[PDB]
């Protein structure tokens, strides 16, 4: 099978203000010594209507990875509201955590994300344009969707 296996992802400070950064505690393991970096990414689905509003919140390389089990904290700044359609701002959307080896995405961990106002005054009379300083991000961490892809591990 694949030479890298993701064991667990923990969503930290999951319910938080929209503008606060994402935090994931990622734990994976590697059957053998790895030649190159593993590239991890966090991708915010700005709009269900088109993938062209995806925002790559961040992209990290974890460098030389031995054959043990490893853990690291993936933190990324919140998406840029100026690229998000107002219609999609409030409601449910998707955030994706992906890992890539030599430019080949081999695993994708996705969560539903609900952006919602917390003051009932705003929930009942939403602003004409989404007020992101008043939105709460809720990553629905109980039920992740994990999708694996076969890549070349040579």
């Amino acid at each position: 099978m694949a030479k890298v296996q993701v064991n667990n992802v923990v969503v930290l400070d999951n319910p938080s203000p929209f503008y606060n950064p994402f935090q994931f505690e990622i734990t994976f393991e590697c059957i053998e010594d790895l030649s190159e970096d593993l590239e991890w990414k966090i991708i915010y689905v700005g709009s269900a209507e088109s993938e062209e509003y995806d925002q790559v919140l961040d992209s990290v390389l974890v460098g030389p990875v031995p054959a043990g089990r490893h853990m690291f904290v993936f933190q990324a700044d919140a998406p840029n509201p100026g690229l998000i359609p107002d219609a999609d701002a409030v409601g449910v959307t998707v955030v994706l955590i992906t890992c890539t080896y030599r430019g080949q995405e081999f695993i994708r961990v996705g969560y539903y994300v609900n952006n919602e106002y917390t003051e009932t005054e705003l929930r009942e009379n939403p602003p004409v344009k989404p007020d992101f300083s008043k939105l709460q991000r809720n990553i629905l961490a109980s039920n992740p969707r994990v999708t694996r892809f076969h890549i070349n591990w040579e």
């Binding site: 689905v45 269900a48 209507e49 998707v94 994706l96 994708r108 996705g110 969707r145 999708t147 892809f149």
Partner: peptide, 15 residues
């Protein structure tokens, strides 16, 4: 809602 749900799921699996 149902259509947007379908779209999000595609993102989860996609390619």
């Amino acid at each position: 809602d149902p259509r947007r749900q379908e779209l999000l799921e595609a993102r989860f699996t996609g390619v």
